[PDB]
Design a protein around this ligand. Sequence first.
Ligand SMILES: Nc1ncnc2c1ncn2[C@@H]1O[C@H](COP(=O)(O)OP(=O)(O)OP(=O)(O)O)[C@@H](O)[C@H]1O
Ligand SMILES: Nc1ncnc2c1ncn2[C@@H]1O[C@H](COP(=O)(O)OP(=O)(O)O)[C@@H](O)[C@H]1O
Lengths: 209, 525
Amino acid sequence: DRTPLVSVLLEGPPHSGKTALAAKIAEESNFPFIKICSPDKMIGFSETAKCQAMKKIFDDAYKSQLSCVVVDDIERLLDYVPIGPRFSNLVLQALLVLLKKAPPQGRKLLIIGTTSRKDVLQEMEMLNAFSTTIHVPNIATGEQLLEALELLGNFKDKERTTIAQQVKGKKVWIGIKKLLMLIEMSLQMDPEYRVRKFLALLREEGASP
Amino acid sequence: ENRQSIINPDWNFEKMGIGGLDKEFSDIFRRAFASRVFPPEIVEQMGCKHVKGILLYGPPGCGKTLLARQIGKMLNAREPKVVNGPEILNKYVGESEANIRKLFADAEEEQRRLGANSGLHIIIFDEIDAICKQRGSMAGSTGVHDTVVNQLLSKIDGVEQLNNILVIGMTNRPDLIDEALLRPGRLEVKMEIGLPDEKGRLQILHIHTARMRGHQLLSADVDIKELAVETKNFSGAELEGLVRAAQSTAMNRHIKSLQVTRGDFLASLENDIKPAFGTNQEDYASYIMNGIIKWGDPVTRVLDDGELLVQQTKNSDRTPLVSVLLEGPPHSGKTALAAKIAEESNFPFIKICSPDKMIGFSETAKCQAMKKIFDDAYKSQLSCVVVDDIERLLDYVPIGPRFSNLVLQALLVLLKKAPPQGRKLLIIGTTSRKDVLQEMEMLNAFSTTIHVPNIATGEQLLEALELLGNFKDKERTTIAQQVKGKKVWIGIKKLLMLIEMSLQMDPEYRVRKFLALLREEGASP
Ligand SMILES: Nc1ncnc2c1ncn2[C@@H]1O[C@H](COP(=O)(O)OP(=O)(O)OP(=O)(O)O)[C@@H](O)[C@H]1O
Ligand SMILES: Nc1ncnc2c1ncn2[C@@H]1O[C@H](COP(=O)(O)OP(=O)(O)O)[C@@H](O)[C@H]1O
């Protein structure tokens, strides 16, 4: 009763699987009003149109005893580009004002945000408007890689042994989505060179933090 | 008197003249008009109103109006009132509403004169999404067409009830229409009319060749299975046009047994009909000119990689969207290799997007054009879209730097949007400045990169000269001895220019000029 409005930020390295987890968290809450505000439905719009669209969704969220609105890929909403820098200010101000406006008496809300560049957000005075943050990590240890491979269930046993032998004595820095992509890319060779090319691709992609 | 005779005395479905839709009609019949044929006693006892309109959306040319007229002619209704969207608007105050208010007059009159025993009236709209758009709310920012929508909403479902009307809307942009115009009270049933598959084309050809078959004017070699398999993404209009062109070409041939034959259909298909959701040879003929000769291994490597990527995007389901980037030094012939990789794919739908057709456009128009190409690409089951120059779209220029930001965001959002369920796509890019693209953090959107190298040895140059075939053996020996040192670094679009600039010199002051030009060009990595 002393906190009708909450917020949270999910951030981490790219290709790490952030939007899926936000969608799952929203799905498994049993609230009666769940909505997603993504930036691929606003291709070609101007600043004012984006403001009006976000405002309309939030306005609709104020007529229900419970709600959950997801706002993903903030940096695309702002139109950030490292050169300059250059972005949109009006959308930023609207977003910074909508994050601490309470609903009418007796109603509740919950906002989840997603991003991949936390420092730039910190510069613009935006980590002060959120209530907490969570961290989504990349795959770190080779045993996790083997577990993910087995759960996906793609490579056979002896191939698993070779991969484990050559990938269990070092470090690994790979995202899950990129892992799916690499597996599918490697599966197109003849049945003899599959493991060799998978190892080559993993070695090439393997980059220091 | 029981009004169970709304159904016309005799009706078959397939005889109507429509072929290719069999679940759309089934669902429409079940959900909409199952209460216009049941005996009036039960309908009256249960006390239920009737559906008051429907919406139809899909591509342009797939037979929407035909279905509306057939629906109307089913229910013994009166003559439909066909209207057009942009033909209602007017410049004076109080004219558009007057036009919109003159369609519901006869229904109201006949409701007055005979209450509850009147006949169905039908109204057919067209491009409905040109008059009705979402209404604004901010004070002082209300739109300019906020009275037409009000005057239509207040009439479809108002304070005085009309129970003898049915409204059908047709549009191609289902996402621009208002939200208060689609609640279960008005225009509640929505249907999609999509491109036909093999069975659809087979039935559409049977229907349109029934007349010729009956009149004994078809030869005994023309078979419809192969003509159905040949046409890939044809709509209905382009099938009827094909049949008509075939008959006309046969008649013209007769002028010099007037029975059409395989050859007539094949010629008409090849040279008369061009689909709008299919491949076109004009682009390949215009971009790949002077052919693709081989002068080394790199060409083979590039083509092999392209083939592998095509196979992956075809035969996988975990990743229904792929991308790739071809980058190399300027003048190295990148667009031709891209258009070649696309032409060997054997995909139903191929299209090229280049800035040659957007001279003088403001950035918003460029966004619209790119978006329209992708929107069309999302309607097929396989596709391949090429983006020609990823630096002339942004308007990059080293001073500043200066460029456009709207187009860049549109492009960065369109490289990660997957197509509707169960469809596939492939994107090929091309650029000469990898580093600048890397600075804007767009070089990690593309899945993979490929390199297009340059001439780097004497024997490669000699083999290119041999393939082009312009000099004699003694001249070849002279050039080989003069440029034996392997310090050659030239493009493959510039070598043709150097050759052609020298050939028009003089009988034997040619090779001297060619060598001088080759030396002056320089060689750096
Ligand atoms: N093996 C080859 N590879 C590429 N192009 C070739 C080859 N053989 C012949 N050509 C011809 O070379 C020309 C290459 O011109 P193209 O416009 O592709 O160059 P580009 O580098 O893309 O252009 P720009 O220099 O403006 O960036 C075409 O006319 C093509 O037919
Ligand atoms: N399912 C179909 N079966 C047979 N012919 C069709 C079909 N769909 C369209 N056509 C042809 O298309 C023409 C009408 O197209 P039209 O209804 O004007 O398309 P749209 O409604 O998209 O404007 C007719 O001449 C008809 O022969």
